Structure formats: structure tokens, C-alpha cells
Amino acid sequence: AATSRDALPNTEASGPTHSKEIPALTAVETGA
Amino acid sequence: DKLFAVWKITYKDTVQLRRKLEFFTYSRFDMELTFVVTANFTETNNGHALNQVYQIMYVPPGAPVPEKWDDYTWQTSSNPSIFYTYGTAPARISVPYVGISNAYSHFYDGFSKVPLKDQSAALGDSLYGAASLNDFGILAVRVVNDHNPTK
Amino acid sequence: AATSRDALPNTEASGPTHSKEIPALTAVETGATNPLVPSDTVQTRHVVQHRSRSESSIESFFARGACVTIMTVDNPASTTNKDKLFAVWKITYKDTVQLRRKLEFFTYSRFDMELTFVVTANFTETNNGHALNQVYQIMYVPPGAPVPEKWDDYTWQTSSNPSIFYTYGTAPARISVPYVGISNAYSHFYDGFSKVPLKDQSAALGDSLYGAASLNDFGILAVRVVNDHNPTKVTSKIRVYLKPKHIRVWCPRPPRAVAYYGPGVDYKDGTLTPLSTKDLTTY
Amino acid sequence: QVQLQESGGGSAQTGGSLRLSCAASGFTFSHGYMAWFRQAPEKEREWVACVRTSGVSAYYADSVLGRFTISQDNAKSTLYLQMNNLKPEDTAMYYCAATSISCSSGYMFWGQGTQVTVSS
Amino acid sequence: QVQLQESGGGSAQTGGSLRLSCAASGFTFSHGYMAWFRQAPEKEREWVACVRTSGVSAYYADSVLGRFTISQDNAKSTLYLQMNNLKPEDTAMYYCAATSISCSSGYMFWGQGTQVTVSS
Amino acid sequence: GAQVSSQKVGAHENSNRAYGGSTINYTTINYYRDSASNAASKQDFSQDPSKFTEPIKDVLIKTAPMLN
Amino acid sequence: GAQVSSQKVGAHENSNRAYGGSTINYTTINYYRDSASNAASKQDFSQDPSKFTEPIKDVLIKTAPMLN
Amino acid sequence: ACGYSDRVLQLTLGNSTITTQEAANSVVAYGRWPEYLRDSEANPVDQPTEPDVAACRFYTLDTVSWTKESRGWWWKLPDALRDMGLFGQNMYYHYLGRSGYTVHVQCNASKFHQGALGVFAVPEMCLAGDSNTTTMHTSYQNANPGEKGGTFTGTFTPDNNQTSPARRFCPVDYLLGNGTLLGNAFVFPHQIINLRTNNCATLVLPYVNSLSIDSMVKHNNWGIAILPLAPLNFASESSPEIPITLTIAPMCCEFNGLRNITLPRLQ
Amino acid sequence: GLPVMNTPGSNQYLTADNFQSPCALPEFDVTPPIDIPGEVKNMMELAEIDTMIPFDLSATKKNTMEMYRVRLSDKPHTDDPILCLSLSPASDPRLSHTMLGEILNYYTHWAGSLKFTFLFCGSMMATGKLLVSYAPPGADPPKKRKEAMLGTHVIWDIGLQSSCTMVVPWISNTTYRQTIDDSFTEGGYISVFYQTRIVVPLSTPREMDILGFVSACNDFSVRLLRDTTHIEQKA
Amino acid sequence: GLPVMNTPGSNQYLTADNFQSPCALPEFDVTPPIDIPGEVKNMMELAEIDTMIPFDLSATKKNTMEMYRVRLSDKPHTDDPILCLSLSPASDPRLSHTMLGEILNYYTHWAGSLKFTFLFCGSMMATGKLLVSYAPPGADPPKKRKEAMLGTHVIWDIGLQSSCTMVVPWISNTTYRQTIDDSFTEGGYISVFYQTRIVVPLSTPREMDILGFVSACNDFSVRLLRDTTHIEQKA
Amino acid sequence: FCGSMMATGKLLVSYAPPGADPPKKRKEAMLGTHVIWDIGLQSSCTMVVPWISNTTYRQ
Ligand SMILES: CCCCCCCCCCCCCCCC(=O)O
Ligand SMILES: CCCCCCCCCCCCCCCC(=O)O
């Protein structure tokens, strides 16, 4: 249902962080 | 120089239509103009001319009248023009009732100026039957294609 | 809700007055224009106003097509020394005077752009030779795309570029181009430079033009005769006519008083005199 | 392409005379007037004189009265401006403004003009 | 068809001088700049020097300072690159990049280039 | 999906049984998918010039003294 | 059997009594029997690139350690 | 009743307060008040820095002088405030920046003095060059004369030294410095300090541009041009002199893309 | 295919046509516009803004800063004009260069009412009473206050309120006037005369300046779009 | 036949038109398509896939396998760059040849956010902390960590998770950047500096390689289709 | 202000918090807390020094 002329996903306001979650760390061995 | 004409738009250059319009004192009419172009060579020669285009630029009163066939005026940023390609059907444009009065005046018993007494006869003189010298403007027509070795 | 073709406010009949109210007195120090109407200063009758501002609307003021440029190309004989002339023009409204000044009445604008193409050809050399009706390709080369170096090189394949093959003699060519600006409005005047001259850098490295954004703002058009060499030379002139449609504008600016000089705001000497001679007490 | 082209020069001594001409073409719809205008070195453009269509009925400017003569030759489609008794006030540019008119003010065609100089 | 064609050769001994020219055509919208660029045998293309539209206001690259001279002749619609004191670092290809610019980097027209060789 | 709009009649023809009278309309149907392609509507709004005429913070009342 | 579709308005004309505003549509009617002949609709779908971005068997959770 | 007047105005921004007893009301440019960027018109993705009190305060630029000889004066915003406290600091620290202003021009005299000064606000006040050979040739160093600003001239004198151009603006007064007749300068938001009446000009300016936020270093949004509509006259004197002082306050300023500081080559 | 017949005009290109045409960049993602302050919808809007009039266009004052200044003095009272001006906003050198005129220079016909505003620029201590008058055409342009006072006018007193406005009420034979000098569509005369005189105490500049502005009124309009002469491109 | 009038543009052929036309093989039995794995709907989809960046394009390393390898070492800590890179995905030699750039080479304008990913390829025993930083333009491109650290960056620690990602947040003056080298639409600078240093125990290769990848983000888009230069046909 | 009615002017009174160079030019003083005073019909002007101090009480 998401057409070609659709507005792209918005940018959500996010603040400071200090948690055990790691968006920054990955492994491009997985191919992903 | 390359001949480019300028004609003062008026119905009174020809006889027929004029007399018909003279059956009354005043009129209002949306005006339709048609343009039938016809060309030919002049000099005895077997030369060639590629199909010619023609611009018909309406120059309303006061607008810059072209002095050359290739001067700035032909840019027509505000003037209404029609580029006719030769051989296709005659050109046509619609012009509404563009009169400054509440009716077009076929006959105007009066003068544009008033000859005052504290003024010289020359300063107060004008024509009999005329309103504004420039009533509707002029049309300007020119061949768009550039010089060709055969006229 | 007040449209373009609306009748203007009527003239209200107002009589004699002798009161402490002062329409006549103001102070143009406030920057504000004193908003009066005849009735405010003189006795008036009632007048049903008929005239409308219809024609003076922003859209209508630009509703005319305008010659932006004259591109010249030719098709010479095969044996010739000189190459077949194919033009490349940088798309800008500032090459001609008329349309530019009209667009300069404001600071910014947005308009879907209509281009018209009036082609006109003729022979040049004294000869009775023949040329069959000629075709013309008008290829729009957006910034960065490969600009044709030859009249017959790969570039004319136009696998992604938008082109128009015009056959001579038929009605003038026309294409629609939307508001393609990189900004949220097209900029008629840009008080700034593209580069910043840093101190840890050489003056040359940090220098640029005054009033320019991107050298290549919209791209170039490329026009060529499609038909191959013909024993008799034929030159052609393609005239482009632009009509800015669906136009919006912002912040009015005084209209250009002296003739244009370059793409900038700059003025040449010898043209710094626009107003003529008139005596103060002479009607 | 109503081509109005002035001629007549302008470099006479004080008191002489010059013949200012003007070649006309295009379509001058006779009826109306045909005239002359001067701009002067540093003044406003001023009306010199006007002659009727084909009629030799004319007028002159207060300043130039009798010292300037404006005629015509509609066979040669020309207008002439003979000027006797040239003076330091007459030193100026002259223009053949001959179109429409109907009076002594309205126009749709002017010329390129020519300069006159009455030296002394 | 803004034809940029370089000339000037390149086969001088170490220390001499050459005159690198460039014929320009098409429509060079004067306003902006006109310049020179070198690619070198095995390096990145580098900016040599840029001269203003018609103005003789220019700059030079740190490396070439004073040893290269870039001018123009807009009557002849040409730009010139005189090069005195040629050296083993100057051995390279030279290009007349003269279009748009506005600075010393932007272009829409280059040339075919020519090679220079300072041997010794 | 035709667009029928009315016209502002100027020169009235001697009719009210076809023309002149009973409101004259016109049809328009877009032929392309792009908004750019459409014909210029001309049915535009007007507005208050006060944003230019009276760029003042405190309202302008013509009847009173400007500077009070 | 006309096909009326809406357009994504870009440059808004100073109108909301014809253009600019009230949703602009366009008409389309096929003229041939062959599907091949039709004009390209352009009203196409988009999709998740994960079929290329995350070709992994076990779901990718950005917030946790990739290899656990 | 209580005595509230149009002439008496007290403006306050941060830790600075401007008063006045002879004003002529105030001008909000194009009726819009300066404002912060709304999510609807946002462009850069990062959290913008809004200095507020740190930058939203009046800054006085050095005072210029007015004499019968004076043709004019001009400045550029944000340029003019390039070295004004934190506003400048922040300006130099970010790639993008948008700001509005509250421009207040001060020039008082006696009821025995006479003349008029038109303080004009021109968004994108592009000025003209000084060369008859090279268009758009004014160098950055001359385009941005900081807090000292520039002036207008009574005559256009071309720059002939093509060995080393002067590369500056030669802004002819009557041409408003941009090839147009001064008399039309009123289309821009404005006030005219006419000695007999007022003593100051206040022009609140919103951020105006083609983009929501833009590189301040590279581009100037507004332009403040002051030219004497009526020449200065005092008593039966031959050399009168009165000063003009400009105090501008950035408003609703926001900056994005924080990075190392830019040290521009101003000289 | 549906039988058709080609009519007069086909294949011709009107620079003022309003037709649909094909798009070069199908599906172009147009960037949305933003609320840019000060939006204009009509040319007249600009016409209603006051613009300073270059009155004194003497060879020594034309094309300078001096053209906008009309200098008054403390000389004894006379009946001779300070400034004369003909109502032909688009053709009179003086008006033709103001915003109004310029916009007017793009049209063939104008109509409506106009308003002139005069700003005194002398010292506070300078007083006076002037008379600005608009006389409709068809007679001798006034040269003495005596005549001018017989027409439409406002008697202005110089004081705390520094600006005065006199409206020129739309009085014309035709519904629209030509945007060029024409007798048939003449406009009349605007004049300014000393009502009393200018008085200044001691140690006060005995001469000062007045600035003039002009602007159209809500009832003003322009028609028949045309090309202007106030600009050209020689070659 | 229905009266018609031919308008401007008729008979012209737009390579980007979208009209209906007659069919050559009426009633052609088209073979139905099948579910062929991996279907693409948009070019951007490919743009979001990570692609290895040929960073070191030295005359001796260009056009080889060595171009993708950025070699680090165990040399003592300095503040000098390991790799510099300018954000101009479609014009910088380094980026211009990655998937992103290539797709970008078919458009005139690009916008959105980009993300770089760095893969360490040393021995398990090798540790370290690097700093990858994106500095927005308008100033001096950093040459020392000191400056780079003042912008947008991620401090990466080499460990069990071998890959690190730093996002370049879309910060630009214009809503869309030119796909060519331009000052007005400049992008800034991407830099990588040693945070600490590389440390390896004995009997361990003292130098190893890091591989770089780039990919667009969900918010990225491209407009104004154009012809590429990354290919040509000479004669 | 205690001059003649006819005397006009605009002064600047400014309070700069400590910890830096005491201003000697308007340029600096203008960077702190201040009020720009215009001499007119209201003859008296007041600038408040807002309590800004490290300690809750000063010696
Ligand atoms: C492209 C052409 C546009 C406009 C053409 C304007 C010419 C109008 C001519 C109208 C003739 C009406 C004559 C009536 C005389 C009168 O009004 O007194
Ligand atoms: C087949 C042609 C396709 C595309 C043509 C692109 C040309 C666009 C020209 C737009 C002119 C708008 C000028 C405004 C200047 C500005 O943005 O600052």
C-alpha cells in the first residue's frame, strides 16, 4: 500500500543516551 | 532593409465593413481577427526559400514600436503575439470589447483639446472627429526566418 | 475568498464635515501609508464600482510567453572544413531583458515552467541547391550530465535526458518543467558567495563570485540538426519562449532603473541617467 | 518601419540659415499632422512647429516665429524646415516628429534627430 | 560546441619556457572565470591558475607561483599561459579549463589537453 | 472528471436563452498526471496590502492622530 | 469507462476555487484492446528493502549485539 | 488617561533595554514576527542550538557621523554582527544558522535641527560593483565590512586598475546601490527619522530567505541602508554634525551542524 | 478514428494561450514551499504603497538625490507656484518613475483614485500652511493660488503631525485613462502653493525640504497588459 | 467532424512523453510471469545496501584489489589522519564508484542521510579505538583529531562486534544537493583518526586492514533523472 | 538629567558582572547588562542591577 509518491518516514526527536543498547555496533559478516 | 509592417488598427481603411458599422452610432463587440498570409518570390531566379514563419505582434498604445526587424521589441514579454507557420490554416485570435468608453464610437462630434484663450492657437488645436490618435494600438508583422539569398 | 475578478469596493456618499477626526493628517515616519479614499477628503456621491483587479493578479502578469534565447545551429556540406554547428545554451532568464525585469519585481518565486520552441531556417550560400525538411533535437542536459562534444557522438542517445524531436514546419515545440529548484523558492538575487575564504587557505582557493549560487543552476539545452550533411548549407534559428505558470512571489523590490550589465546587479557607466529634464513649475 | 530620417546638419554661424529635411516612409496615414520638435542642449523637449497632413496650414512656436519655415512635399513624401536668422538660443537638436498628431503633441513615430549649432 | 583547443607543445629542456594557448569558441558567457589545470603524470588533477572573465585579476598555485603567467586576449578570444623556469615537477599535461568557474573549481567545459615535458 | 467553471461575462450578446444571460460556463479536463502540465487556472485570490501599507505594530486608525 | 486519478500537487497556484486547493484530478481512457498499448500508470508501490538489506534467517534487532 | 504614547517605547531583550521618548511607532517587517523553525519547515536533522538570551540581546555597533556631506551608510545581517558576543561565537561554530532582528537606529538632535534619514531594510541587499570590465567582482573581504559597515557614494567612478582591482561595491546613492531609483525604496519595510518629529527607527525583521536555514558565513539575509533623504541643516552653520548609532538584536536564532570554528579571511 | 475537422488557428502559437502540454520530467519530486514572509498576490498591492516623487527634475538636479527635495523658504507670501504637476502618472517624467508609474507602464489603461502625501522636513520650530490642489482638466492650468483654490484641494497646516495627504478623486470622462500622454484622456493638474508663508525664529535654517509620495487607492485598477519602454536591449 | 484546433507542441516527439499508441501484434498471448525471487521496486532500495568503498586510490593502488584496504598499524599515537573523505557521494572518486554513487550518477539531485560502516580485519588479539567523524562544511577540513572531534562523530572500540557504524545526519542548506562538485551544495568532511592506537601482542601481524562501506538511509531520495558519464561509446 | 529643556541625548548605563576586564569602551560595556536611555520629557531613567552573585550573600 505504500506508493511511490509517499512522504518518507519522519525524523523523530531523540535526546541524550547512556544505555546497554548498541545501535552503533554491528557485524558485516552476517551479510546484513 | 527587411520590410516589416506596422498598421494602425482600425476598421476604416477598407470600405465594406466600415459602412456596415456606420449603420449605427455606437457599438460593443468582442473582436475576432483572422490572418491569411500569402507569399511569393520576386526576382527572376530559381532560388530557394524554406517555409517561412511570421510573427504578428500586437503593440498596444504606448508600447515600444519596433524600429528594426531584429531589435529587442520582438521579445514580447507582455505583448500578445502569434507565430504563424506558412501553409497551415489561417491565424486567429480573440479580442474582447476593449473600449475605454461604455460603447465604441463610430462618430465623435468633438475635439480632443480645448483651445483656451490664455493659450496659443497651436497649443489648443486638434482634429475634428478624433478621440485619441492611438485608439487601439498597432500590429507589427515580421518574417521570423533570417535573410535568404532569394527574395 | 476575495478573488481576482471581484468588483472593487464601492464609493460611499459622504457629506460635509467639521469634526475632531483627521483623515488628512498623518506621519510617514511610521513607514505606514495613510489609507484614504476620496470620501475622506472631499464630498462624494454613491458609486457602484464596476472595475476589477482581474488582470493585475500575479498569475496574469506573467501569463505571456517570452523570448529567453536564440539558439543557432547549422547543417553544412560534408566536404566542409568547419564542423556542423550545434549550440549549447545555459538555461537562464537573464540573457534577455524583458522577462528578467518582470521577474525582478520580487525577491523570490516559484513557477512551473513552460518553454516554447520556434525554429526558423534558411539557406546561406548563393546556389539553387536543395535541403529536405529538417528535424531538430532539443536535448536538455541537466547539471553534471555529459555535454555533447560532437554533433554525432554518443550523448545524443538520451537514455535518461528529456529530448524533443521537432520536425520543421509543424507547430512550435513545447514542454512543461515543474518548479525544479533546490531551494524553497527560486532566488532572483543572492547576496552571498558560494565559497568561504578561510585563513588557513589561499585566497585563490577561497574565492568565488558575488551573487552566484551554483554556477550550474538548471543545466544546458543542446540543439542539433538531426539530418545528416547536405550539399547545400542550411542554417537554423531556434527561438525559446518561456511562460512562467503557477507563479508565486515574495517581497517586492524596486524595478530596475538602469540597463542591465552582466548577470549581476551591477551597472555600467554611461547609462546612469534615467530621468529626463523637467522644470519644477512646468506642467 | 515608418522610417523617419532627419538631415540638414548644424554648424552655422550666428544669423544664417539651414534646411532641415526628413525622409518619410512606411505608412504615414496622411490625415493628421506632421511636425518638428527640439530637445535643446539642456532643457525639456519642446515643440517647434506643426504642419497639416498635406495642407499647408501650419503654426509656429512663439520662440521661433517667422524665423523658421516648415513645409512639405507629399509627392516626395518629405517635410522641410528652413531656418533663417539662427541664434544662440536655437542651438539644439531637432527632430522630425511627423505621425498621427491630430494636434501638436501626440506621436507614435519619431526620428533619430540631428544637432544644430549656431556659433558665435 | 564551446570548442576549447589547447596548444603550446611540451618538450623543453629544464629551465626554459613555453607558451600554452587555448582557442575558445561557442558561447563563453564572459562573466565568471577562465583557467588552467594540470593532471600530472601520476597524481590527481590539480588547479594551476585562474584569471577573471575579461579582468586581468588572477591568482597562481603555490607550486607555480611567479613561474607561470596566465593572461587573455578577449579580442582574440584566447587565454595564454607563459611558463618560465620549467622544471622536473612541471612535467605534465596541461588543460585549459575556462568556463563558468566563478571561483577556481567549477566547470562545464574542458579541453583535450596537451603534454609538457621538462627533460633533464 | 471534468472541471466546470463559470466565466465573467463581458460583452453580452443579445441573448438570455443561450448566451448573455443564464450563466456561461466552461469545461476543463486535465490530460496529464503531472501538476506542472495543467493549464493555468486564473481563479486566484486577492489580499490585504496592509502587510506592506501598514507594517506597524499598533493598529492604524485613519481618523485619529498618527502619533499619539 | 474513464479513469479519474489524483495528482500530487507541487507548485500551488494562488487558487483554492479551481486549482491549488480542492484536489486536482486527471482523466484517462484507454483507446486500444491490448494491454501493451496503455499509457504507463506511474501509480506504483514501494517496498521493504530488507530482502536485500537483511538477508538473515534470524531477525535483526538494531539495539542488541549482532552476534549473540 | 494613563499617558501611553506611540513615541514612548521600551524594548527589552535578554539583559538589555532600549528606551525612547520620540518614536514613530514600530515596524514589523511584512507583518511577520521572527520565529523558530517549525517541524513543518525543518530541514537539517540534528538538534538545533537556540542560544536565546545568550544571543538574543541588543548589540551596539560603533557610532557613525552625519554631516551635510554624507551620502549614505550600509550594513549586512548577519554580517554586521559577526563579532558580537556569543551570537558571533555561535555563528562561527555552525554550518547553518537562521536569525531575525530588532534593528533600532538612534539619531537625536534639537528642535532647531532639520533633516530626514530613511533607514531601509532590504532582504538580499545586493550592491553594485566598481568595475566597467568585470561584473560581480567584489571580493568577500569587501562584501562584508563587518560592524564598521560601508557607505554610499554620490558618483559612480569606475575602477581602472586592472593590474590589481579594488574589488569593492560602488553603491550609487540615488540608485539605492542596485540600479533602481531610490524613490522606490519604500517598498521595503521602513521608517524615516525626520528630526522635527522623532529620534529613532525600529525595524523588527523576521528571517527571510529561500531556505529555512542557511549558511550565515556565506550569505546575508537582510540589509540595512540609511541615506539622507533631506540633508542635514542646523542654524546658520556651515558644519553641523550629529551622530547615528545602530543597535541590533538577533532574535529567535537557531544554529545547526556543530563543528570546529571557522576563521574567515576577512582582510 | 473520431472524425474531426481542423479549424482556423490550428498550429499557431499564441504567446498568451493557456494550453496543456507534455511534461519533461515525469514524477518530479517538487520540494514544498515554505512560509516566506511577505507574499504578493496582485500588482496593485504594490501600487498602493507610497513612493517618493522626483519632482524637481532640473538638468542640475535630475538623476541625483536632489530631485526628490522641493525646497521651501521663509520669503514673503506670493501667489506663485512651488511645484506644478500634471496628472498623467505613467507619462509625466516626475510620476513615471515611481512604483505606481512603473506598474502603470506595463498596462495600457489605468483607472481609480490617487493620493499624494507631502512630508515636511524642516526644524521643529518652523511653521506654515501650504495648499496642495488638484484641478480637473479642461481649462487653464492655474498659475496663481487664486485659481487653484477653485478646484479640489486641502489646506495643510504644518505641525506635530508632519505628513499631509490630499486625495485626487477619480474624475474622468472615460472609465479608463490611457497610460500615455493624451488629450482625450487627460488628467488635470496637481499644484502646491504657499497658503500663508514659512516662518522660522532666529538661528534657524531659513530654507528646508519637502518630500512627496504617491500611491494608488483601493479603488484603483489597471488593464490591457503591455510591454514597457523603461528598458531596452540594444543589440 | 468535431471541430478542432491544433495546439503548440503537436507532432513533436518527447522522449519522456507517456502516450497511448497502436499495437503491432494484436491479441498476443503473453506468457505469465513467475515468482522470481528478489524483486525490486525502486532504485533507492539498492542504495540502502552497503557497498565497499575504494578509499586509497593511489596510482599504485587504484584500479586494483588494494584500493578497498585501508591499512592501520601499531605505530605510536599521533593526531594525523588515517583517511580523509569529502561528502560528495556522486563526485568524489572514492564514493562515486559505489552503488550509491552510481545510482546517484543518474540523478541531478540527492538528499537524505548516509551511513558509513567500517569493518576491522585484523587478528582477534588486535585491539584499538578509532574515531570516525563527519564535520559539516563551511570551515577548515580537520587535519588533527582535535578539530574533527568537535563535529559529528562516533568513538569506536574494536572488539567482539567487528563492525562499527557512523551515521552522517542530513545537514544541508538546501533541501537537495547537486550530484556534482559544487560549493553551494557542499557536503562536508568524513574523517578517521586513531583514538588510542592499535595494540597487538607478540607474534602478531603488526599491520592489518579495515574495509569501508556506504549506504543511504530510509530517508534518502534522488530526483531529476539524468544521463551518466560513467560510460560512453566512442564512435 | 539636569540640563535645559532643549538639550537632548542618549546615554548608556551598564552593569557588567565581575570576572573580567572592567570595560573602558562602550563596546565592552554594551555586552553586559544595560539600559539605553533617551533624554526627554521623562527626565529620570532607572537601570536595575540584578542580583547575580556566586554566594548567597556578599561581604
Ligand atoms: C492581438 C490583438 C489584441 C488587441 C487588439 C486591439 C484592437 C481593437 C480594435 C477595436 C475596434 C473598435 C472600433 C470602435 C471605435 C471606438 O472605440 O470609438
Ligand atoms: C527539458 C527541460 C527540462 C528542465 C529544464 C530546467 C531549467 C529550469 C530553469 C528554471 C529557472 C528558474 C530561475 C530561478 C533562479 C534560482 O533558482 O535561484
CATH number where C87 lies: 2.60.120.20
**Kind of pairing between the strands at E68-73 and F3-6:** unpaired
Considering only CA atoms, which residue is closest to atom 13 of ligand 2? C186
Number of Cβ within 10 Å of residue K5's Cβ equals: 9
Tracing cell 512635399 back to the chain, one arrives at D73
Specify the 3-state DSSP secondary structure of D106.
strand
Query: What CA–CA distance (Å, rounded) separates B64 from C97?
Result: 14
The span from the first CA to the last CA of chain F, in angstroms, equals 59
E strands, chain D, are: 5-7, 17-23, 33-38, 46-52, 58-60, 68-73, 78-84, 92-97, 114-116
Contact C96, B75 (CB under 8 A): yes
Dig out the grid coordinates for H227 from the structure.
541615506
| Closest to C266 measured CA to CA, from C277, C258, C274, C275 | C258
Query: What CA–CA distance (Å, rounded) separates G20 from G13?
Result: 5
Residues 6+ apart with CB under 8 A from J81: J142, J143, J191, J192, J193
Residues 6+ apart with CB under 8 A from C86: C73, C148, C151, C222, C223, C224, C225, E1
Residue of G nearest to F41 (CA): G19
Query: What CA–CA distance (Å, rounded) separates B40 from J4?
Result: 29
Contact C8, I218 (CB under 8 A): yes
- CA C5 from centre of chain: 26
Cα–Cα distances (Å) from B79 to B64, B138, D107, I224, I225, in that order, read: 10, 11, 20, 9, 7
Specify the 3-state DSSP secondary structure of G19.
coil
Q: E strand or H helix at K39, and its extent?
A: strand K33-39
- Per the DSSP assignment, residues forming a β-bridge with E116 are E92
Specify the 3-state DSSP secondary structure of D13.
strand
CB proximity under 8 Å: H 133-152 to E: 133-137
Query: What CA–CA distance (Å, rounded) separates H136 from F36?
Result: 34
Contact J181 E42 (CB under 8 A): no
Identity at H206, one-letter amino acid code: P
From chain C, the residues in CB contact with H123 under 8 A are 107, 251
| Structural domain containing residue G57 | 1-68
Establish whether residue B63 lines the binding site of ligand 1, counting it when its CB lies within 6 angstroms of any ligand atom: no
| Closest to C30 measured CA to CA, from H116, H25, H19 | H25
H160-189 burial, b at 16+ Cβ within 10 Å, e below that, comes to: eeeeebebbbbbbbbbbbbbbbbbbbbbbb
Burial of D41 (0-12, 13-18, 19+ CB in 10 A): exposed
A5-14 burial, b at 16+ Cβ within 10 Å, e below that, comes to: eeeeeeeeee
The span from the first CA to the last CA of chain K, in angstroms, equals 32
Considering only CA atoms, which residue is closest to atom 1 of ligand 2? C140
- CA H129 from centre of chain: 19
Establish whether residue B58 lines the binding site of ligand 1, counting it when its CB lies within 6 angstroms of any ligand atom: yes
- Ligand number nearest CA of I223 is 1
Number of Cβ within 10 Å of residue C6's Cβ equals: 14
CA–centroid distance, C100 to ligand 2, in Å, is: 13
In angstroms, the separation between the Cα of residue I79 and the nearest Cα of chain D is: 25
Contact F4, F27 (CB under 8 A): yes
Residues 6+ apart with CB under 8 A from D31: D53
- Where on the phi/psi map is residue I65: left (φ > 0), alpha (ψ -120 to 50), or beta? alpha
Query: What CA–CA distance (Å, rounded) separates D18 from C8?
Result: 58
Query: What CA–CA distance (Å, rounded) separates C273 from D5?
Result: 25
Cα–Cα distances (Å) from K43 to H11, H19, J42, K7, in that order, read: 18, 12, 73, 11
Query: What CA–CA distance (Å, rounded) separates J94 from J230?
Result: 14
Query: What CA–CA distance (Å, rounded) separates H205 from H35?
Result: 10
Specify the 3-state DSSP secondary structure of B16.
helix
- Does the bond joining A16 to the residue before it have cis omega, within 30 degrees of 0? no
J140-173 burial, b at 16+ Cβ within 10 Å, e below that, comes to: bbbeebebbbbbbbbebebeebbbbbbbbbbbbb
Query: What CA–CA distance (Å, rounded) separates B129 from B131?
Result: 7
Query: What CA–CA distance (Å, rounded) separates C266 from C260?
Result: 7
Query: What CA–CA distance (Å, rounded) separates D45 from J100?
Result: 69
Burial of C196 (0-12, 13-18, 19+ CB in 10 A): buried
Burial of H204 (0-12, 13-18, 19+ CB in 10 A): buried
With residues binned 3-state (H G I as helix, E B as strand, rest as coil), the percentages for chain F, rounded to 5, are: 10, 15, 75
Dig out the grid coordinates for F4 from the structure.
466546470
Considering only CA atoms, which residue is closest to atom 14 of ligand 1? B104
Query: What CA–CA distance (Å, rounded) separates I173 from I184?
Result: 8
PDB resolution in Å: 4.7
**What secondary structure does DSSP assign to chain J, as a single string?**
-EEE-PPTTTT-EETT-------SSTT--PPPP---S-----HHHHHTS-EE------TTTTTSSGGGEEEEE-PPP-SS-SEEEES-TTTSTTTTTSHHHHHHTTEEEEES-EEEEEEE-S-TT-BEEEEEEEE-SSSPPPSSHHHHTTSEEEEEEESSS-EEEEEE----SSSSEESS--STT---EEEEEESS--B--TTS-SEEEEEEEEEE-TT-EEEEE---SS-----
Phi, psi of C270 (to 5 degrees): 95, 5
The three state secondary structure string of chain C is CCECCCECCCECCECCCCCCCCCCEECCCCCCCCCCCHHHCCCECCECCCCECHHHEHHHHCCCCEEEEEEEEEECCCCCCCCCCCEEEECCHHHCCHHHHHHCCEEEEEEEEEEEEEEEEEECCCCCCCCCCCEEEEEEECCCCCCCCCCCCHHHHCCCCCEEEEECCCCCEEEEECCCCCCCCEECCCCECCCCCECCCCCCCCCCCCCCCCCCCCCEEEEEECCCCCCCCEEEEEEEEEEEEEEEEEEECCCCCCCCCCCCCCCCCCCCCCCCCECCCCC
Cα–Cα distances (Å) from I28 to C112, C140, F37, H182, J82, in that order, read: 11, 15, 12, 41, 40
Specify the 3-state DSSP secondary structure of F36.
helix
Contact I183 D105 (CB under 8 A): yes
* Closest CB to A4 among G46, G53, G63: G46
| Closest to D114 measured CA to CA, from D95, D88, D86, D97 | D95
Query: What CA–CA distance (Å, rounded) separates E34 from E72?
Result: 9
| Closest to E18 measured CA to CA, from E76, E67, E78, E74 | E67
Contact I28 J223 (CB under 8 A): yes
Q: How many domains does chain F have?
A: 1
In angstroms, the separation between the Cα of residue J80 and the nearest Cα of chain G is: 31
CATH number at residue F32: 4.10.80.10
**What secondary structure does DSSP assign to chain E, as a single string?**
----EEE----PBTT-EEEEEEE--S---SSSEEEEEE-TTTS--EEEEEEESSS--EEE-TTTTTTEEEEEETTTTEEEEEEES--TTT-EEEEEE-SSBTTTTB-S-----EEE--B-
Contact C187, C36 (CB under 8 A): no
Specify the 3-state DSSP secondary structure of K29.
helix
The three state secondary structure string of chain H is CCCCCCCCCCEEECCEEECCCCCCCCEEHHHCCCCCCCCCCCCCCCCCECCHHHCCCCEECCCEEECCCCCEEEEEECHHHCCCHHHHHHHHHEEEEEEEEEEEEECCCCCCEEEEEEEEECCCCCCCECCCCCCCCCCHHHHCCHHHCEEEECCCCCCCCCCCCCCCECCECCCCCCCCCHHHHHHCCEEEEECCCCCEEEEEECCCCCCCCECCCCECCEEEEEEEEEEEEECCCCCCCEEEEEEEEEEEEEEEEECCCCCECCC
| Closest to B145 measured CA to CA, from B49, B37, B46 | B49
Q: What technique was this entry resolved by?
A: cryo-EM
Cα–Cα distances (Å) from H240 to B8, H66, H236, I65, in that order, read: 60, 8, 9, 20
Phi, psi of C39 (to 5 degrees): -50, -30
Considering only CA atoms, which residue is closest to atom 10 of ligand 2? C218
Question: Which DSSP letter does residue B18 get?
Answer: H
Interface test with C, best of D39, D44, D47, D105 (most C CBs within 10 A): D44
I25 at interface of G, judged by CB pairs closer than 8 A: no
Question: Which DSSP letter does residue K25 get?
Answer: S
- Ligand number nearest CA of B101 is 1
From chain C, the residues in CB contact with F61 under 8 A are none
Contact H224, H97 (CB under 8 A): no
Question: Which DSSP letter does residue G45 get?
Answer: B
Contact C166 J12 (CB under 8 A): yes
Query: Domain I1-235's class?
Result: mainly beta
Q: How many domains does chain C have?
A: 1
Query: What CA–CA distance (Å, rounded) separates J143 from E62?
Result: 19
Indicate the length of chain C as a whole number.
283
The three state secondary structure string of B95-125 is ECCCCCCCCEECCCCCCCCCCCCCCCCCCCC
E strands, B15-113, are: 26-27, 31-35, 53-59, 81-85, 91-95, 104-105
Phi, psi of C239 (to 5 degrees): -100, 125
Tracing cell 525604496 back to the chain, one arrives at H185
Dig out the grid coordinates for J182 from the structure.
559544487
Query: What CA–CA distance (Å, rounded) separates H205 from H102?
Result: 6
Burial of E56 (0-12, 13-18, 19+ CB in 10 A): middle
Contact C168, C133 (CB under 8 A): yes
| Closest to J193 measured CA to CA, from J57, J78, J115 | J78
Establish whether residue B9 lines the binding site of ligand 1, counting it when its CB lies within 6 angstroms of any ligand atom: yes
**Kind of pairing between the strands at J83-86 and J107-111:** unpaired
Cα–Cα distances (Å) from C241 to B74, C64, C92, in that order, read: 11, 9, 12
Binding-site residues on chain F for chain I (CB distance < 8 A): 30-40, 42, 44-47, 49, 51-53, 65-67
Query: What CA–CA distance (Å, rounded) separates H141 from H148?
Result: 13
Residue ranges and CATH numbers for the domains of chain H are 1-267 (2.60.120.20)
Dig out the grid coordinates for H233 from the structure.
541643516
Identity at B57, one-letter amino acid code: M
Query: Alpha helix locations (H) across B11-131?
Result: 16-21
Contact C96, C241 (CB under 8 A): no
Dig out the grid coordinates for I159 from the structure.
505641525
Specify the 3-state DSSP secondary structure of B33.
strand
- Per the DSSP assignment, residues forming a β-bridge with F3 are F28
Contact C146, C78 (CB under 8 A): no
Cα–Cα distances (Å) from B35 to B79, C222, F9, H158, J5, in that order, read: 18, 33, 26, 52, 15
Residue of C nearest to E57 (CA): C204
Query: What CA–CA distance (Å, rounded) separates C19 from C159?
Result: 78
| Closest to C265 measured CA to CA, from I99, H122, I54, E57 | H122
